[PDB]
Amino acid sequence: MLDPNLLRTEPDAVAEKLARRGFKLDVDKLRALEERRKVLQVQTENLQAERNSRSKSIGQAKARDIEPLRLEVNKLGEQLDAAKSELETLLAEIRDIALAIPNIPHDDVPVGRDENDNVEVSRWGTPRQFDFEVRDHVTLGEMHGGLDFAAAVKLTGSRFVVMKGQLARLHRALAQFMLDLHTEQHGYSENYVPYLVNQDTLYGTGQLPKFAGDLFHTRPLEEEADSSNYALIPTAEVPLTNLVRDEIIDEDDLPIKMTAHTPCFRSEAGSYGRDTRGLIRMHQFDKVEMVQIVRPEDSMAALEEMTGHAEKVLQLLGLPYRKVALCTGDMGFSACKTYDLEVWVPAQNTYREISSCSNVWDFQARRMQARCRSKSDKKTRLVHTLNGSGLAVGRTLVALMENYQQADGRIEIPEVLRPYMRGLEYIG
Amino acid sequence: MLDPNLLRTEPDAVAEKLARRGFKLDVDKLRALEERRKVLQVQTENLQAERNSRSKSIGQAKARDIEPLRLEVNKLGEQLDAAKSELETLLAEIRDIALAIPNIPHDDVPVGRDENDNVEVSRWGTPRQFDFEVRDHVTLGEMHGGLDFAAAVKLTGSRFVVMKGQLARLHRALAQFMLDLHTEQHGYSENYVPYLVNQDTLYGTGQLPKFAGDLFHTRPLEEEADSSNYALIPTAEVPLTNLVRDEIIDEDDLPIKMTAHTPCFRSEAGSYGRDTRGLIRMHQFDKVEMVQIVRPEDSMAALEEMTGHAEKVLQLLGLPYRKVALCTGDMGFSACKTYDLEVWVPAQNTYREISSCSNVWDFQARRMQARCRSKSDKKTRLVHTLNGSGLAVGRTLVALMENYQQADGRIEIPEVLRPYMRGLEYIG
Ligand SMILES: [Ca+2]
Ligand SMILES: [Ca+2]
Ligand SMILES: [Ca+2]
Ligand SMILES: [Ca+2]
Ligand SMILES: [Ca+2]
Ligand SMILES: [Ca+2]
């Protein structure tokens, strides 16, 4: 959520910055609600005061007939409860609006309508020239018997996979390599997190209220009927960022750099048509996430650092990619600035997204009440949060299989992964 | 499900074997339903025949007024549809009974009422004598800051954990070691499986119809409204065993030995009281599963082999345990014979279940229609299925932390795990 006082003080300026995302801030409705809120707030607080006073008058005469006084306190209590509910319903209408507002893009972000307006910043490696017709990862999967989509339709349904044997081992090897890289060389602490999360968590990172439809939701448990409305995690950004919810972190302890290897679950609503075949656009997919909790003045530097960490995975793996600065119109909900790394995909003859590194500014920190404090001063302030994949494991497996395929369909194991595969050079 | 002809031919004998589990087979109701089924079946099949014949009489005269004949075929079609529905409702009542019948215990299984009647077969290693008061894994978790239950209550709710740092790394190290042991030394092929499964899968391994309440269920997706009634996997036995559903496997290709590392999800319904604190009885927990698909005559040998594989993990890790032959009254629904490995838990001053290895006989194979065929003969037969954990990773972490704790709370890394931890000797 945006700073409420920034919406109060200069709403036309924030609406202008938000218009660059293609978002129309309803400034008039927000104002009309806010003006009614002050009227209800003065009435409620006056009722609270007079109920508190009449309650004290009873206990004073009780020591000294507490009946005509007792009736009045019940009439005021009825009045105050009605007043408080009426105010709360209005507070809930303001929240419906405020919490559906995307983040203000930082001035570094190029102005754009959509993905066609994204700016290329960097490019690394040169796409492989093949001496045969390139096979896709699905075709190679079938040749090895290692990627079985039909078995996953049988166990579950569409947009699921069963990996079998050496290709399943290679997928594990990729995740191990990424976790070891970030924990051993990049200063990230490793975490095992729940894959089911509550509504507070989802509100905290921005999935709720606007993106409930993107999630798999669980039915409450009979023995936890009022505390088990859970959703499956769509990214480890959700559990990891929420670890600092309702915390005051000493600035000396920042940055907090966390990594996790988890499955991610997406309903893929609206994706009716785009990427029907393959490990791309799945309901279930593994990712090795990087999350940073930093001091407000270090977030821009941390973004460059984190993007560099995801780039390092691609470079060590010998996978050519392009680095893209996302424009105002192609950014995710919580982000103020984003870099997407797009890996070369031989069968698609283009680069495809494999990492999306974002600086969230204080947008999630405000929702979570995540703040920091220098012991030197009497001043707490919201932290900045960042997240990015290093990398989407399923998409890395696609890029690896396709870029390293041999004429006969064998997969060459990238040199940096051979220690993770007992020195094995080829699958097949 | 049990063989329908074994229920038809000798129901008093199967009811006798089932009574040893403490299960009363309603032989009288099954018989009454079966007698009505034959009456409805003769009526339906007679209606099917006469509708088929009257339909053919139309097409014969159509070549040669197809109106008094067309009315009759519609009256018979109405009659047949009603007859078929009435029969199907009765078929569904037989299924409600047949599919809630547990497996017949094998004669090897000792007769018992409950867990207090289980027979100890073997014992390995000697429980450690400590020179200080033993701390539990929760206390050690807190000392290291590596096991955070409060953070998991915040992200989700109770019976969840957040593992942070070195203890999170050690948990990953355990799973890697188990997967490497079974794939490199024990002949298991590695698999990546969906963590969400459909109703057919659940019926196949026996979770449905009787144990829906033990599961986390997902709400159907709007864009898959009639094909996304999924549940979270409670064990990898569910997706792995179901890979052979509707298959005729060449006997030469058996045994099919599969392993996976997955999170497992349990609602823990009825567990109100038992194990309130710790990594024991969680809603989410990791397991390294072993599943075997074998020829009917090799299942008993495969059980001993598989139990030995789970024992090997414990022996290499230097964790003392006891091997227990479960009695008739303490077996799981699908099992005909089971061995439980119970690991020594210093803070509990007892052995606790860490693996449950079962021979399922043809019980799941019958539900899944999983069969094998020798090319030499014109004879298909149901395969036998087996499953067991090698091991429950969370429970291994508990046993490791507690058995290897040092006076100051440091955790000694078992010698066999040090290569998985970059040679690290101690955590802390
Ligand atoms: Ca510091
Ligand atoms: Ca994007
Ligand atoms: Ca974001
Ligand atoms: Ca063979
Ligand atoms: Ca048991
Ligand atoms: Ca079983």
Q: Which ligand is nearest to the CA of B255?
A: 4
* Among A135, A159, A266, A371, the one annotated catalytic: A266
Q: Do A242 and B169 touch (CB under 8 A)?
A: no
The alpha carbon dihedral of B398, B401, B404, B407 has a sign of negative
Question: In 10 A of CB A357, how many CB atoms?
Answer: 29
CB-CB contact of A393 with A370 (8 Å): no
Amino acid of residue A306: M
Q: Do B223 and A269 touch (CB under 8 A)?
A: yes
Distance of CA A54 from the midpoint of ligand 4 (Å): 88
- Domains, chain B, in order of start with CATH, read 1-102 (1.10.287.40), 103-428 (3.30.930.10)
What stretch of H or E contains A286? strand A284-294
Alpha-carbon distance of B146 to B107, in angstroms, equals 46
A356 is in an annotated binding site: yes
B353: nearest Cα among B309, B310, B405: B310
B294: nearest Cα among B385, B189, B182: B385
CA atoms within 13 A on the CB side of B50: 16
Cα A426 to chain center, whole Å? Answer: 36
Alpha-carbon distance of B190 to B290, in angstroms, equals 10
Residue positions counted in chain B: 428
Ordered strands of the A371-373 beta sheet? A248-250, A371-373, A380-382
Q: Is A227 a catalytic residue?
A: no
Alpha-carbon distance of A341 to A323, in angstroms, equals 5
CA distance A156 to chain B (A): 4
Alpha-carbon distance of B334 to B235, in angstroms, equals 13
Q: Is A395 a catalytic residue?
A: yes
Q: How far apart are the first and last CA of chain A?
A: 51
Q: Which residues from A are below 8 Å from B420, CB to CB?
A: none
Alpha-carbon distance of B261 to B222, in angstroms, equals 30
What Å distances lie between residue B113 and A139, A225, B105, B351, CA to CA? 54, 33, 13, 20
Question: In 10 A of CB A364, how many CB atoms?
Answer: 29
A161's tokens: 């996979």
CB-CB contact of B229 with B183 (8 Å): no
- Going by C-beta distance under 8 Å and a sequence separation of 6 or more, which residues neighbour residue B75? none
Q: Which residues from B are below 8 Å from A422, CB to CB?
A: 184
A55 is in an annotated binding site: no
CA distance A170 to chain B (A): 10
CB-CB contact of B181 with A249 (8 Å): no
Alpha-carbon distance of B246 to B372, in angstroms, equals 11
Distance of CA A169 from the midpoint of ligand 4 (Å): 22
Alpha-carbon distance of A70 to A6, in angstroms, equals 45
Q: Do A155 and B232 touch (CB under 8 A)?
A: no
What Å distances lie between residue B216 and A409, B101, B267, B389, CA to CA? 40, 23, 6, 21
B144's tokens: 């290291």
Amino acid of residue A215: L
B119's tokens: 């027979």
Q: At what angle do helices B27-61 and B68-98 cross, to 10 degrees?
A: 160
Alpha-carbon distance of B229 to B288, in angstroms, equals 26
Cα B89 to chain center, whole Å? Answer: 28
A268 is in an annotated binding site: yes
A354 is in an annotated binding site: yes
Q: Which ligand is nearest to the CA of A336?
A: 3
- Going by C-beta distance under 8 Å and a sequence separation of 6 or more, which residues neighbour residue B334? B102, B103, B205, B206, B358, B360, B363, B364
Ordered strands of the B248-250 beta sheet? B248-250, B371-373, B380-382
What was the resolution (in A) of this experimentally determined structure? 2.4
Which of B155, B221, B283, B367 to mutate against chain A (most A CBs within 10 Å)? B155
3 state SS of A422: coil
A353 is in an annotated binding site: yes
Q: How was this structure determined?
A: X-ray
Alpha-carbon distance of A398 to B307, in angstroms, equals 37
3 state SS of A242: helix
CA atoms within 13 A on the CB side of A301: 6
When CB atoms are compared, the residue of A176, A227, A263 closest to B195 is: A263
CA distance A223 to chain B (A): 7
When CB atoms are compared, the residue of A189, A194, A218 closest to B164 is: A189
Question: In 10 A of CB B25, how many CB atoms?
Answer: 20
Alpha-carbon distance of B17 to A319, in angstroms, equals 61
A355 is in an annotated binding site: yes
Alpha-carbon distance of B394 to B282, in angstroms, equals 9
When CB atoms are compared, the residue of B156, B196, B201 closest to A216 is: B196
- Partners of A261 in the β-ladder: A288
Alpha-carbon distance of A309 to A287, in angstroms, equals 14
* Among A36, A172, A281, A410, the one annotated catalytic: A281
Alpha-carbon distance of A186 to A182, in angstroms, equals 5
B389's tokens: 């954990």
- Going by C-beta distance under 8 Å and a sequence separation of 6 or more, which residues neighbour residue A166? A144, A146, A427, A428, B190
Per-residue HEC secondary structure of chain B comes to CCCHHHHHHCHHHHHHHHHCCCCCCCHHHHHHHHHHHHHHHHHHHHHHHHHHHHHHHHHHHCCCCCCHHHHHHHHHHHHHHHHHHHHHHHHHHHHHHHCCCCCCCCCCCCCCCCHHHCEEEEEECCCCCCCCCCCCHHHHHHHHCCEEHHHHHHHCCCCCCEEECHHHHHHHHHHHHHHHHHHHCCCCEEEECCCEECHHHHHHHCCCCCCHHHCCEECCCHHHCCCCCCEECCCCHHHHHHHHCCCEEEHHHCCEEEEEEEEEECCCCCCCCCCCCCCCCCCEEEEEEEEEEECCCCHHHHHHHHHHHHHHHHHHCCCCEEEEECCHHHCCCCCCEEEEEEEEECCCCEEEEEEEEEEEECHHHHHHCCEEECCCCCCEEECEEEEEEEEEHHHHHHHHHHHCECCCCCEECCCCCHHHHCCCCEEC
Amino acid of residue B428: G
Residue positions counted in chain A: 428
- Going by C-beta distance under 8 Å and a sequence separation of 6 or more, which residues neighbour residue A120? A322, A323, A324, A325
Q: Which residues from B are below 8 Å from A265, CB to CB?
A: 196
Amino acid of residue A260: A
- Partners of A339 in the β-ladder: A325, A357
Q: For strands A256-265 and A380-382, give the pairing.
A: unpaired
Q: Which residues from A are below 8 Å from B165, CB to CB?
A: 189-191
- Partners of B372 in the β-ladder: B249, B381
Torsion of CA B285, B290, B296, B302, to 10 degrees: -120
What stretch of H or E contains A261? strand A256-265
Alpha-carbon distance of B215 to B230, in angstroms, equals 10
Q: Do B194 and A156 touch (CB under 8 A)?
A: yes
Q: Do A193 and B162 touch (CB under 8 A)?
A: yes
Torsion angles phi and psi, residue B324, rounded to 5: -120, 130
* Among A20, A159, A352, A356, the one annotated catalytic: A356
CA distance A49 to chain B (A): 34
Q: Do A190 and B200 touch (CB under 8 A)?
A: no
What stretch of H or E contains A208? none
CA distance A95 to chain B (A): 21
- Partners of A191 in the β-ladder: B164
Residue B24, exposed/middle/buried by CB under 10 A (0-12, 13-18, 19+)? exposed
B196: nearest Cα among B249, B259, B104, B262: B262
Torsion angles phi and psi, residue A140, rounded to 5: -60, -35
3 state SS of A129: coil
Q: What DSSP designation does A116 have?
A: G
Distance of CA B163 from the midpoint of ligand 1 (Å): 21
Q: What DSSP designation does A251 have?
A: G
A72 is in an annotated binding site: no
Q: Which residues from B are below 8 Å from A179, CB to CB?
A: 172
Cα A289 to chain center, whole Å? Answer: 10
What Å distances lie between residue A425 and B188, B191, B261, CA to CA? 21, 20, 24
CB-CB contact of A148 with A160 (8 Å): no
Amino acid of residue A413: I
Q: Do A155 and B223 touch (CB under 8 A)?
A: no
CA angle (A233 as vertex; B194, A355 as ends), nearest 5:
90
Q: Which residues from A are below 8 Å from B221, CB to CB?
A: 216, 267, 269
Q: How far apart are the first and last CA of chain B?
A: 51
Residue with tokens 């283009």: A350
CA distance A419 to chain B (A): 12
Exposure class string for A318-333: b at 16+ Cβ within 10 A, else e: bbbbbbbbbbbbbbbb
B302's tokens: 């495969």
* Cis peptide bond N-terminal to A255, omega within 30: yes
- Partners of B355 in the β-ladder: B341
A113's tokens: 């309508």
Alpha-carbon distance of A326 to A332, in angstroms, equals 10
Q: What DSSP designation does A104 have?
A: P
Alpha-carbon distance of A288 to A174, in angstroms, equals 9
Alpha helices in A105-248 (DSSP H): 137-144, 149-155, 166-184, 199-205, 237-241
- Going by C-beta distance under 8 Å and a sequence separation of 6 or more, which residues neighbour residue B280? B352, B394, B395, B398
Q: Which ligand is nearest to the CA of A253?
A: 1
CB-CB contact of B381 with B117 (8 Å): no
CB-CB contact of B188 with B222 (8 Å): no
Q: Is B353 a catalytic residue?
A: yes
Alpha-carbon distance of A165 to A151, in angstroms, equals 14
Alpha-carbon distance of A154 to A177, in angstroms, equals 31
Q: Do B267 and A223 touch (CB under 8 A)?
A: yes
